[PDB]
Amino acid sequence: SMISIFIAEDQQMLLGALGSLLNLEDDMEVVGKGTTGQDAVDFVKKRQPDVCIMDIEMPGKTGLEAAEELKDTGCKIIILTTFARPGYFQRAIKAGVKGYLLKDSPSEELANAIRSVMNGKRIYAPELMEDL
Amino acid sequence: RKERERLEEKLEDANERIAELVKLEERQRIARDLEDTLGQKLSLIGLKSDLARKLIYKDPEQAARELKSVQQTARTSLNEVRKIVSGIRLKDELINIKQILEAADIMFIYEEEKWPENISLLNENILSMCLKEAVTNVVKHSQAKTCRVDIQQLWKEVVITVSDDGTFKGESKGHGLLGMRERLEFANGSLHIDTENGTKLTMAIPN
Amino acid sequence: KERERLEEKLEDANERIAELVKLEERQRIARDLEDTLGQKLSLIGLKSDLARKLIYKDPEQAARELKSVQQTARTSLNEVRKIVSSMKGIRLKDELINIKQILEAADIMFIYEEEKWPENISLLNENILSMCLKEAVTNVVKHSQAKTCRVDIQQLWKEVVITVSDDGTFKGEENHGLLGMRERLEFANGSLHIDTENGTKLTMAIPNN
Ligand SMILES: Nc1ncnc2c1ncn2[C@@H]1O[C@H](COP(=O)(O)OP(=O)(O)CP(=O)(O)O)[C@@H](O)[C@H]1O
Ligand SMILES: Nc1ncnc2c1ncn2[C@@H]1O[C@H](COP(=O)(O)OP(=O)(O)CP(=O)(O)O)[C@@H](O)[C@H]1O
Ligand SMILES: [K+]
Ligand SMILES: [Mg+2]
Ligand SMILES: [Mg+2]
Ligand SMILES: [Mg+2]
């Protein structure tokens, strides 16, 4: 019923704001928060949440590296980025991320992407497509 | 003979092409810092505004707290951008007077390179104020077709000259000429005027 | 060695000249970035202060104001994604596409096979190589009368090596773009070599990890 979410984001202010934004949803629950890629790998392999919200650039292991390590766990990974950098998109797809969105996308669209991803869909920001 | 000139241009272009790389390297460095600072902050603002809007009725006290963080993030982010440098205000006055003179159909004669970089912030600001007034006077009174502005570092002074090819219209307390002189003299500077071939103001301040 | 203290003096001298070009650049960027984002950021502060101060008195208006903050941030960030992208310059992958188009339009066979593509190169060194690659190919098109052009781009040891070969005839004297490329590569502690026997072949290298 309730979608369990783990959030990996190295910037504490943003991590806290995302948790607050997602806990506002009736059908969602933030079950854990982390600041590194390793925090995501450890929680997801142990606690097995439905969804993992993953920042890319974090210290130790990036969210893309964490996504690769969790490829065959049954967890649905959504990447969040502020900037569209080259090869980020192709590495995201190849790692099997289910969502690849902008961090500043309105919260109503992030919660919708979590539901769509839970429904087996792949949600990629057109802005992040390495073709405009 | 003038193979001198041929070679000298050859060297200046080589210096100028290396200059472009130095720029492009720093330009690279700034893009990385904007993407790190400014980008991460504009995302925080978006997210905290969104949340604050959602908490207005549910928890108005938290919505108020988020809006404090938003305002602070915004203020420091505008401050982090002014902090890319940290300074010259006479360069900003230069821009103002170019616009004003162009709008008035008066040819502006200046050289961007010769502007003194080292002067106290106070004395720089006094000169900016006097430069503005000298040019306001050109526009309002001279009927000039040309205005020249010189800025020279002469021994222990910064000297600015504002000349125009119009005609002097004067024959006072609370107005420009005396105002500039009083402010400059208080700063141990000076103001001199020549009204023979149009109007020329010479303003100097210690440096 | 006295030669070490003199090497110090050229290092200290170069840096002094360099910091002045950087200072002109910081001054250019800082003025333009303020000119385009300055009012938008100040508008976020005011509209956020105003919304906080209306939360209890007019919650409807606080909400109206937050919608405005919401979109100001969003569009300011979109302008930055643009600023930041532009500031980074011509990517080598994009230049390789430009030269394919240029050679095809000139009826010159383009021979390229990806091998040892640089895994990580600085944005500066990438931009320098893009500039050199463009010029090497402009020269092929304008002067060589080639029917074929072979480009190799490889990470070899601690360098990125680009070779641009053509099967035309070299038009220059025994000894502009050729000096431009050499100087820009050498600035980056790279190199440019040329062989003009069987057409023209340029070997350019730049350091990389
Ligand atoms: N560049 C110039 N060309 C021609 N006449 C000028 C001139 N600068 C000054 N004058 C003359 O000298 C007078 C005195 O100038 P001043 O700057 O003290 O007062 P003002 O007329 O500009 C009012 P305020 O400066 O307070 O706006 C002007 O009114 C004008 O007749
Ligand atoms: N790929 C090539 N094939 C044949 N000749 C070439 C060549 N590249 C260069 N050359 C010869 O070397 C000369 C100098 O080359 P260079 O690239 O430095 O300047 P340029 O003549 O192309 C002017 P610019 O590069 O500024 O447009 C050319 O004029 C031409 O005779
Ligand atoms: K909840
Ligand atoms: Mg991060
Ligand atoms: Mg006046
Ligand atoms: Mg050329």
Side-chain angles (χ1 to χ4, degrees), chain A, chain B residues 1-154 156-207, chain C residues 1-172 174-209:
Chain A
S1 60
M2 274 263 266
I3 307 161
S4 48
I5 303 149
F6 177 86
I7 319 174
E9 171 55 59
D10 66 305
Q11 308 239 253
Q12 244 150 59
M13 278 289 128
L14 294 58
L15 174 64
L18 289 158
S20 307
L21 268 174
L22 293 176
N23 279 314
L24 282 189
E25 300 300 320
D26 288 335
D27 64 342
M28 283 173 202
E29 191 184 9
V30 179
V31 290
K33 283 186 278 176
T35 56
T36 66
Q38 195 59 58
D39 284 352
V41 176
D42 295 347
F43 192 96
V44 169
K45 286 186 172 172
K46 209 175 176 168
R47 311 293 178 220
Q48 302 175 353
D50 300 324
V51 179
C52 185
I53 311 289
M54 197 89 81
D55 176 36
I56 297 177
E57 297 290 6
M58 300 191 279
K61 277 179 180 172
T62 75
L64 285 180
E65 273 153 38
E68 289 169 351
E69 282 198 300
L70 301 162
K71 199 160 162 182
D72 294 317
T73 67
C75 186
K76 286 151 190 84
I77 297 165
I78 302 174
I79 288 294
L80 291 190
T81 188
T82 305
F83 293 91
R85 301 189 217 193
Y88 262 8
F89 177 82
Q90 283 302 316
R91 198 191 169 178
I93 294 157
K94 286 187 231 88
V97 313
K98 298 301 168 206
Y100 175 29
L101 312 164
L102 301 154
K103 272 195 220 175
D104 65 285
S105 65
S107 56
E108 28 272 290
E109 296 176 357
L110 173 54
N112 283 345
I114 296 156
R115 289 175 191 115
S116 293
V117 151
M118 282 300 295
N119 232 275
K121 310 297 202 185
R122 273 179 198 255
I123 310 300
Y124 279 50
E127 298 83 40
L128 295 163
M129 245 124 268
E130 284 174 42
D131 306 293
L132 253 131
Chain B
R1 277 193 159 191
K2 304 263 94 178
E3 233 283 342
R4 188 194 144 178
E5 302 185 331
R6 198 214 62 79
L7 283 159
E8 277 177 48
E9 289 171 64
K10 189 175 80 178
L11 180 46
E12 229 219 86
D13 305 339
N15 296 328
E16 225 64 37
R17 282 195 266 90
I18 287 137
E20 295 329 295
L21 290 168
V22 173
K23 284 185 185 180
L24 191 58
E25 177 178 47
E26 191 69 0
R27 192 179 296 165
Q28 286 322 309
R29 194 200 59 89
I30 303 146
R32 285 138 180 170
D33 277 303
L34 295 169
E35 120 204 315
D36 281 314
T37 62
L38 193 47
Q40 297 315 125
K41 313 274 65 165
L42 282 174
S43 289
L44 191 57
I45 291 167
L47 290 174
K48 306 193 128 191
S49 291
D50 216 319
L51 173 60
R53 206 192 58 254
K54 303 214 183 294
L55 286 220
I56 281 159
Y57 292 110
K58 313 213 158 188
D59 182 13
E61 311 251 357
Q62 202 48 50
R65 266 168 235 117
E66 298 303 324
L67 295 176
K68 255 169 91 173
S69 287
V70 168
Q71 200 197 306
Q72 178 263 322
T73 313
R75 278 237 217 176
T76 66
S77 300
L78 181 43
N79 173 43
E80 276 300 293
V81 172
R82 292 154 175 191
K83 210 218 73 177
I84 288 292
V85 255
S86 191
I88 288 106
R89 150 91 181 93
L90 204 45
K91 283 169 195 137
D92 294 317
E93 194 44 44
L94 183 165
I95 295 166
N96 285 326
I97 66 165
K98 195 182 303 157
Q99 302 175 69
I100 283 157
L101 288 166
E102 148 66 61
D105 306 300
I106 303 176
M107 216 180 279
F108 172 62
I109 285 62
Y110 88 107
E111 286 144 66
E112 226 175 283
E113 197 141 38
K114 295 191 63 182
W115 290 46
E117 270 227 302
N118 270 307
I119 175 169
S120 76
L121 190 48
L122 170 59
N123 286 18
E124 193 181 321
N125 177 36
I126 294 165
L127 288 180
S128 287
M129 198 185 313
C130 295
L131 176 57
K132 182 176 174 147
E133 174 55 17
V135 172
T136 295
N137 284 344
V138 169
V139 173
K140 293 205 305 188
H141 315 292
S142 74
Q143 321 265 47
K145 175 189 126 78
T146 316
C147 177
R148 178 189 282 274
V149 174
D150 281 59
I151 211 148
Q152 312 159 0
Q153 210 133 10
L154 297 313
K156 278 72 178 166
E157 293 185 318
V158 168
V159 178
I160 303 183
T161 73
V162 178
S163 55
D164 76 67
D165 69 351
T167 57
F168 191 74
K169 309 300 197 299
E171 301 195 342
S172 297
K173 290 168 178 182
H175 300 289
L177 265 67
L178 184 52
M180 286 185 293
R181 179 174 276 165
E182 282 183 321
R183 188 54 176 107
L184 288 155
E185 289 184 351
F186 184 78
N188 301 302
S190 60
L191 178 160
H192 293 340
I193 191 164
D194 179 0
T195 63
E196 291 276 58
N197 56 13
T199 307
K200 181 177 207 179
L201 273 180
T202 306
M203 300 155 288
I205 210 167
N207 195 31
Chain C
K1 277 286 115 209
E2 49 277 85
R3 285 158 263 260
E4 291 181 287
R5 183 47 194 157
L6 263 148
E7 254 304 349
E8 233 176 304
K9 278 173 184 177
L10 305 139
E11 188 205 309
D12 305 312
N14 270 286
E15 183 39 48
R16 283 204 62 79
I17 286 139
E19 82 213 16
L20 303 198
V21 162
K22 295 181 183 162
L23 278 165
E24 296 152 35
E25 197 58 6
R26 293 190 192 96
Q27 283 207 266
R28 197 199 48 82
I29 273 132
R31 203 173 264 105
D32 207 46
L33 231 51
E34 184 145 21
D35 182 67
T36 71
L37 307 178
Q39 294 181 319
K40 283 189 170 202
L41 279 172
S42 276
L43 200 54
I44 284 159
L46 295 163
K47 281 188 156 144
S48 288
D49 194 341
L50 184 65
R52 188 174 84 236
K53 273 157 203 173
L54 290 161
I55 270 166
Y56 309 100
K57 298 176 174 193
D58 202 335
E60 308 269 33
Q61 200 56 55
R64 283 166 203 128
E65 292 316 320
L66 295 176
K67 200 158 196 169
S68 194
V69 183
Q70 272 262 269
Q71 267 312 123
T72 314
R74 226 132 266 171
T75 69
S76 298
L77 187 48
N78 272 292
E79 253 315 299
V80 169
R81 292 197 263 253
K82 277 137 216 162
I83 282 166
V84 164
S85 105
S86 132
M87 274 182 112
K88 296 184 166 206
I90 323 298
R91 306 306 301 251
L92 203 47
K93 282 190 167 173
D94 294 319
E95 189 50 42
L96 186 58
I97 296 166
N98 283 329
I99 69 163
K100 185 181 268 280
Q101 301 178 67
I102 283 153
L103 288 166
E104 286 183 23
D107 307 300
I108 303 175
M109 182 161 105
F110 171 65
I111 304 172
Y112 174 81
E113 174 137 294
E114 185 161 295
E115 176 67 28
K116 292 176 191 74
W117 188 269
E119 198 149 302
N120 277 315
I121 178 169
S122 76
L123 284 167
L124 177 58
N125 284 11
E126 195 184 313
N127 289 345
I128 292 165
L129 287 180
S130 289
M131 240 182 299
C132 297
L133 179 54
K134 179 179 213 165
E135 175 56 15
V137 172
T138 297
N139 282 345
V140 169
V141 172
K142 296 205 303 188
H143 315 291
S144 73
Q145 301 164 297
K147 297 297 162 74
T148 81
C149 180
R150 212 235 131 85
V151 175
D152 288 280
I153 302 168
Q154 302 196 20
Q155 176 74 51
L156 297 161
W157 189 5
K158 296 173 197 165
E159 295 183 314
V160 176
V161 179
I162 302 188
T163 73
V164 177
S165 215
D166 77 67
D167 70 349
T169 60
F170 190 74
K171 304 305 195 299
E174 223 206 293
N175 189 19
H176 297 292
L178 283 162
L179 185 55
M181 286 188 281
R182 180 168 283 170
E183 282 183 306
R184 76 170 66 95
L185 290 156
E186 291 186 351
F187 163 88
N189 314 291
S191 57
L192 184 153
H193 303 307
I194 189 168
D195 172 13
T196 60
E197 190 58 19
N198 264 61
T200 306
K201 180 179 211 177
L202 277 175
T203 308
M204 306 150 240
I206 210 165
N208 196 39
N209 189 48

